[PDB]
């Protein structure tokens, strides 16, 4: 029973991972073949860079401005910067923009979203002056609409690139996200790879590795069938016609529980998917963005993401129906997520109730083996030995995502981490009950000594990985090369 369940769990996980690896490799080969035919100095499609953010760090904002300015392309129509807040303390980033670009803040009287005239020419007079935006704080979603209107007024603009205020762009990042959409008329949206520059914290490095694995596996598998989810965000491109025709539905929608400043991206991706147009993802473009370094902040972000996914899963299935002979993989993955969550919860409950040493050791060894296989594949793909630290991601995943998902499902004097504390107390009580019930020493039994040896080996491996990670931080080997110059420049202020 338990052994059969563990075996089927392991074989299903291995098969799905192998299939996703094959799909990602096929997509990468197709993209490489497409790139091999790219002519030199290709500037067929114009780019309109739109930058939005709120409470951006001055150093991070300056670095992002330098990175987008350092981008090399044949022709750029303009750069659009939209700032969510217009308070006195919010003028710092506007003045920073005046240090890098022209002083064209031109504070609008009111946000254009609820304005009677939804035309960008009301607040903009010249298209070549790189106008800035200082709107009142009314939500991050409203900020993107103003930039979209500003980009849409120019008939010469054929596509736009969406980048966050904190993200860091490369020299060829802009070209790599606009080339794929031009070759195929069906393809209209391109997603760029996102990376985390800072990895000093154990949580930050695990989050970075998880993001890298997700982008290189799930995004590639989705792009093979051209059903990419969450295409938008940092380092993201959109064709002008689709965004022009779907701007109104994306902004006129209402929600019951909305954050003060969240920003909706899954809804935009789903709205793009309604038209049936195909979306591809490329890993060649590289973007660098920060990640939270606090456990509570990471838990809150995961809860918000889970709530958004649960809200949007209703409309996610409808998009797959529109596509002919396509989207079945997306629907299967969407069902697989909830099936996997329910099955892992049931397995955890069963192993906690039974409190059998043989079953727990077997399942923990299977989990360690599959995690080691995944880490080895990530190291082989990334050509870096730092991917072997992904084994410790299981602990933080189990301790954060599951309470976050439970809280998100329940939602749909903080009273946000209460469910997390209840889950921690429950798992601690289950562990105490398991260790108390199985309190004996019988070295004669082969099964008991085998379980003890296995658990001791697992603990030794975990301790060794923790020790090598800890000494790596002092050696500073685990520090990413990009963040070294960042902290050096911050020190040399």
């Amino acid at each position: 029973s338990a052994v059969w369940g563990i075996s089927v769990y392991g074989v299903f996980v291995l098969g799905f991972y192998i299939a996703q690896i094959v799909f990602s490799e096929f997509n990468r080969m197709r993209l490489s073949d497409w790139i091999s035919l790219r002519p030199d100095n290709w500037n067929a499609t114009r780019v309109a860079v739109i930058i939005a953010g709120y409470r951006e760090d001055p150093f991070m904002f300056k670095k992002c401005l330098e990175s987008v300015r350092d981008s090399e392309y044949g022709n750029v129509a303009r750069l659009i910067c939209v700032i969510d807040g217009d308070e006195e303390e919010d003028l710092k980033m506007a003045e920073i923009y005046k240090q890098v670009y022209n002083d064209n803040v031109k504070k609008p009287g009111v946000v254009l979203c609820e304005s009677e005239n939804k035309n960008g020419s009301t607040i903009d007079s010249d298209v070549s002056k790189n106008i800035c935006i200082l709107q009142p704080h009314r939500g991050k979603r409203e900020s993107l609409y103003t930039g979209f209107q500003l980009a849409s007024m120019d008939p010469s603009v054929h596509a736009v690139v969406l980048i966050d205020s904190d993200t860091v762009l490369e020299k060829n990042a802009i070209l790599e996200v606009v080339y794929p959409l031009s070759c195929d008329p069906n393809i209209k949206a391109v997603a760029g790879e996102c990376k985390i520059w800072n990895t000093d914290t154990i949580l930050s490095m695990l989050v970075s590795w998880r993001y890298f694995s997700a982008f290189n596996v799930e995004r590639g598998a989705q792009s093979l069938w051209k059903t990419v989810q969450c295409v938008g965000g940092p380092l993201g491109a959109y064709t002008i016609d689709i965004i022009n025709e779907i701007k109104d539905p994306w902004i006129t929608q209402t929600f019951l529980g909305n954050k003060c400043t969240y920003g909706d991206n899954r809804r935009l991706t789903n709205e793009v998917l309604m038209r049936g147009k195909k979306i591809v993802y490329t890993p060649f473009a590289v973007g660098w963005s920060d990640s939270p370094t606090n456990v509570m902040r990471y838990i809150v972000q995961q809860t918000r993401w889970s709530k958004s996914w649960c809200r949007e899963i209703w409309y996610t299935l409808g998009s797959a129906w529109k596509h002919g002979f396509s989207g079945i993989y997306l629907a299967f993955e969407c069902m697989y997520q909830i099936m996997y969550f329910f099955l892992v919860m049931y397995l955890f409950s069963y192993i906690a109730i039974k409190a059998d040493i043989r079953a727990q050791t077997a399942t923990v060894l299977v989990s360690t083996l599959v995690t080691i296989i995944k880490s080895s594949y990530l190291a082989l793909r990334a050509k870096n030995l730092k991917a072997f630290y992904f084994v410790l991601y299981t602990y933080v995943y189990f301790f954060c995502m599951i309470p976050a998902r439970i809280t998100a499902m329940f939602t749909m004097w903080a009273k946000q981490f209460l469910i997390t504390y209840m889950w921690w107390a429950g798992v601690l009580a289950a562990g105490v009950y398991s260790i108390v019930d199985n309190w004996y020493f019988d070295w004669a039994d082969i099964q008991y000594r085998f379980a003890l040896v296995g658990i001791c080996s697992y603990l030794v491996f975990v301790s060794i990985v923790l020790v090598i990670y800890l000494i790596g931080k002092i050696t500073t080997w685990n520090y990413t090369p990009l963040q070294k110059e960042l902290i050096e420049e911050r020190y040399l202020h």
Epitope: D437, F441, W443, D445, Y448
Partner: nanobody, 123 residues
């Protein structure tokens, strides 16, 4: 833990008998139950035993000779007497062990004992 032995009797050769060692306490599955025989001529020798994980252990010519089983419903251990012969006439005892070493045949390994029961066979 308290161990009480009950069963036994006088039967002909090749008969079947059942011996059970009643026990009680806070925990019973953790304890390791083994059966020891004692004859007037010699000392106590290991014949059969069961571990916490229902592992079966037998002595020489006990692998298929006798069967040992335990259940947690009534917290007792029972052994089956198969193909009884006069040379097997000995006093049977049951022992419970929580912490022990690698060895199990040694008489002093088990720190608990019981009153025991008398089994006698003649022909």
């Amino acid at each position: 833990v308290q161990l009480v032995e009950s069963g036994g009797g006088l039967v002909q050769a090749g008969g079947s008998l059942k011996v059970s060692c009643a026990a009680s306490g806070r925990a019973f599955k953790t304890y390791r139950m083994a059966w020891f025989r004692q004859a007037p001529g010699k000392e106590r020798e290991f014949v059969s035993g069961i571990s916490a994980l229902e592992t079966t252990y037998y002595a020489d010519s006990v692998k298929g000779r006798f069967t040992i089983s335990r259940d947690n419903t009534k917290n007792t251990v029972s052994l089956q007497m198969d193909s009884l012969k006069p040379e097997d006439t000995a006093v049977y005892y049951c022992a419970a062990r929580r912490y022990g070493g690698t060895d199990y045949t040694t008489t002093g390994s088990y720190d608990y004992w019981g009153q025991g029961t008398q089994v006698t066979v003649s022909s």
